Amino acid sequence: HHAAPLPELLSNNGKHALMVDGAPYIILGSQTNNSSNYPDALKDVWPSMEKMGANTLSIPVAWEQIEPVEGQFDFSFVDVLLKEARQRKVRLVLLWFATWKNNAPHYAPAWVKLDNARFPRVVKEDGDTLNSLSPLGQNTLAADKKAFVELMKYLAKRDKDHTVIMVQVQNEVGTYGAVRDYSPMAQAVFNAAVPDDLIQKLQLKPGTWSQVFGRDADEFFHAYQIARYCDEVTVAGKAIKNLPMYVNVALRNPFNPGLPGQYSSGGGTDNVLHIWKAAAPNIDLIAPDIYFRDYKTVSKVLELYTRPDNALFVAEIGNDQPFARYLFPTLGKGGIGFSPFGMDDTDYTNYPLGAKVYNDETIEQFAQVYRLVNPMMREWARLSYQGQVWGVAEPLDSTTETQKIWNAEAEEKEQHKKDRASALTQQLDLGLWDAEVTYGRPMFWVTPPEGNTPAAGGALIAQLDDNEYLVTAYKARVEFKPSQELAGKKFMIERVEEGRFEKGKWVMERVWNGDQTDWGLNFTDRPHLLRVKMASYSVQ
Amino acid sequence: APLPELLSNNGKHALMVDGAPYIILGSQTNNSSNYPDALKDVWPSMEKMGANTLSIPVAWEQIEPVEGQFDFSFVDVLLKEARQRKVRLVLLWFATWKNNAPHYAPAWVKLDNARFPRVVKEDGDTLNSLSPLGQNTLAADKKAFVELMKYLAKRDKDHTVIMVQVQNEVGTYGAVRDYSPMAQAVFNAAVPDDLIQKLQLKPGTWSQVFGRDADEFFHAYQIARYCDEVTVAGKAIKNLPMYVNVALRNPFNPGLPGQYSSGGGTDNVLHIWKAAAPNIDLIAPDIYFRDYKTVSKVLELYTRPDNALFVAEIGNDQPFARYLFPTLGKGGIGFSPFGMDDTDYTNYPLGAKVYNDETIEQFAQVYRLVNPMMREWARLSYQGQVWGVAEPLDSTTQKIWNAEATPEEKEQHKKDRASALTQQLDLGLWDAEVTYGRPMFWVTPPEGNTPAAGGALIAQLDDNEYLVTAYKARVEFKPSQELAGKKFMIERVEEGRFEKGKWVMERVWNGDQTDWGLNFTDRPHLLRVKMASYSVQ
Ligand SMILES: *[C@@H]1[C@H](O)[C@@H](O)[C@@H](O)[C@@H](CO)[C@H]1O
Ligand SMILES: *[C@@H]1[C@H](O)[C@@H](O)[C@@H](O)[C@@H](CO)[C@H]1O
Ligand code: NA
Ligand code: NA
Ligand code: NA
Ligand code: NA
Ligand code: NA
Ligand code: NA
């Protein structure tokens, strides 16, 4: 009665897919608050997930809850979770909160986190101790592995249709307040030769850590040791059940990071991705956690984490209104998923990170974008993997009260308007055709774009054939034109159809024509999925 | 079922109801709701409030409208309707005094001055305040009070009525004492031996013994004796707890007796009251001061080794709700907001200008923190260690000065406010810091709620374990003493509830929910917090 293929992350042609039930899949995700991982809290999780239209829930499973006393395992939460997820026909990503949760051992059992002699903490260069477990603690590694193995044996036994499609190993590893462990135990490894395997993979000359890496030795050392720790846990679990597994990064600012220890040292930050990929070959991907609000910073993060060797998964993102539009470039980069944080009614907000008020309007900002993708999820996922997709978001953030003042003053207003219109105009090269995406304009005539208030728009395009595209967009205009000069030919829209996929087959609902195609393709907040066919034609 | 009883032991107190400590999460009616037809306008509010006990008058005029012709028809209906709703009652005996006056004494009492005489001023004019030296008045009040207690003895065997208030706000406005010939004959004479013995003073006349306090202390003594005799007579029928409620003088700047209600249990005569009326179980403050400092001072003065704290009347406007927390943290046995019914009356500017669902909800939200643990809290308060705090700045009035202010005076002002909105509690090995009006994430300093509203309750369960619930506040734990090289953490925070006296865990708070203290909004959460120190060397 259970014949479904394991989920798997595939990588080729520099592109990636999360295979679920034997085909590409997109996680249109929701993630709970940090204290929702108990049976009694789930009634405060599912309603939000339904309102959001999410297909996949990310939720912790804590070491402390599965092994409250050493060797006495308790999977009562996982049992209820699996059953309730199945009732609602959603899938799960389990977050293993264990040796590290945001740098710290708070979710390790008391017999772990209160026994430093057995399970040692990072020691600073000055001799003081931080509440961050050292990745050189061999007992810690053994005990985390043992518990993780038991979790994976529970899923092997009790989740044969793979309700759980992926597992996050740890949560935001690293250390705040120091660059590495400086304990005697750590110093002995630091003072010794860099392991051959790393030297070989990075194509460097042999030496000790300080000799090989200079001023980067302390940070690279901590990243290597954490990555090896996480890889060993990962390998042990996959030996039981070979699900995709990943780590999530407490990001450093990519333009102005500050110093390791200010940001979480040793996690998969952009400067140690090479270390993590060398050190942890069994981990499937390294996922950014995004709480930067501004378009330029978010865009840079998506660029850094989308690599031929690294599928893009936005494992955590804020739940305030500005964040919703980042679904569009995430999917346009070939991303496999997107998981806004704090999507439950458990009476907590991490404002000022996320939304100040958690209510139906908060959820609706995400529901409105997920409604663009849900009706085509499998078709999009395949085109993303096997084809050409594009995706953009509105590239100016909302005007501040600062800019609000500097506007009341200003001939200057007119130039500013021109500059904003240009910035709110995006070009995409789709082969024989280009698209121009603009934001915040009427659905008729050609008044320049002025942006949405607040910033919110975006667009998704997939290429179906040389002259045919799937298009859906949000609070935006999409206009097509030839990509190269036509040698005396004219061009037009040949046909725009609005429709849907049913059992993989396109069903046309209506043709957009006349006013609906004279002024580009204009989208509001409501979902429309279009197939657009362009033509060039001779006039003699 | 066992009689309710007020216990006092080890300077602590409990109201025992059904053989265990109980907290009155009270509602009190308006003054004209003591009739069967009005009760339909009382119960819906009580239900919305989540109150467990109703305080309501029973008037001498209604039970004895004609001398010797008793009528308990209201008491019957009340008992039956209270039982239907599974709530308890505190009956307020409105008789010789209600707010200094005899308006609730039967017409055959209050219109017969020669039989039942009034206070006479020094100048010979008469006040509408019955003299405590009227022996007829004492006998008549006592007789009727006895009949009421007989009704409860015969008709309330399960003690729906758990306590009785004897009179309401006794004393006299407009004069310090009775200066009638009858009163002068007693005043111009020896202080009674018993009072001299209990205060350890030298024998003499009132004037000799007490000097410039004589007049006021005389009035307080004679009213206390009156109230004790009524009390004793009633308890001899049915030995319920019985108390008196005080029209407070301002504790910082009282003015003169007569301006405030002279002779009641004001803070300067609590020694007289305790000496003269040993059968009265407690003296309860009636609080209509809105401001934190005065309210706090009142709670301090009335919480004594010899006096259980019962807030027998408090305003029903929004600022008053948060005073439940310090009341319970002092080991108070109850709290009773006034005017909780829909009988088309507001005592604004004392209470709320508007009575509506929002008015009630400000109290419902704090009662919802206590109801789920009421019996457990009550036992901890008596037998153990509890604490409770309220947000210590009132709502900003001040906004003129904040407007005219340098961006140096302002940053100074926000720092001063942050410090004032930070409270420290010494819980033994561990301290708690309580702050008000800040996000649930990071450490931006407190700026207070608007309006002021927050508070916290803590009970100690063990050396390192506390029961915690709070409201629009952050609670953070730290070691109370330097740890000598050890570190510390929260070991475990559990949200849960008591079922059959047993703790049931619903979820564990961790991660974001414990990284930045324990953050509470308007919604109820009951936590068990276990702290640990641990070696790193
Ligand atoms: C991301 C992190 O993974 C998550 O558990 C939570 O701590 C949030 C903040 O609310 C982020 O730090
Ligand atoms: C307190 C008093 O006991 C009560 O009956 C009522 O008169 C109020 C005012 O509305 C307070 O004086
Ligand atoms: Na092209
Ligand atoms: Na449609
Ligand atoms: Na008590
Ligand atoms: Na202490
Ligand atoms: Na101390
Ligand atoms: Na609860």
TrEMBL record, chain A:
Instruction: Tell me which domain of life the UniProt entry assigns to the organism this sequence originates from.
Output: Bacteria
What does the record list as GO biological process?
carbohydrate metabolic process
TM region(s), chain numbering: none
Q: What InterPro entries does its record include?
A: DUF5597, GH, Glyco_hydro_42_N
Which species does this protein come from? Cellvibrio japonicus (strain Ueda107) (Pseudomonas fluorescens subsp. cellulosa)
Its Enzyme Commission number?
A: 3.2.1.23
User: A Gene Ontology molecular-function term?
Assistant: beta-galactosidase activity
Matching entries from SUPFAM superfamilies are given as:
(Trans)glycosidases
Domain Glycoside hydrolase family 42 N-terminal, chain residue ranges per copy = 44-194
Tell me where in this chain the DUF5597 domain is found: 366-523
Q: Which UniProt keywords apply?
A: Glycosidase, Hydrolase, Signal
Q: What is this protein called?
A: Beta-galactosidase, putative, bgl35A
- Listed GO CC annotations: beta-galactosidase complex
One Pfam family this sequence matches:
DUF5597
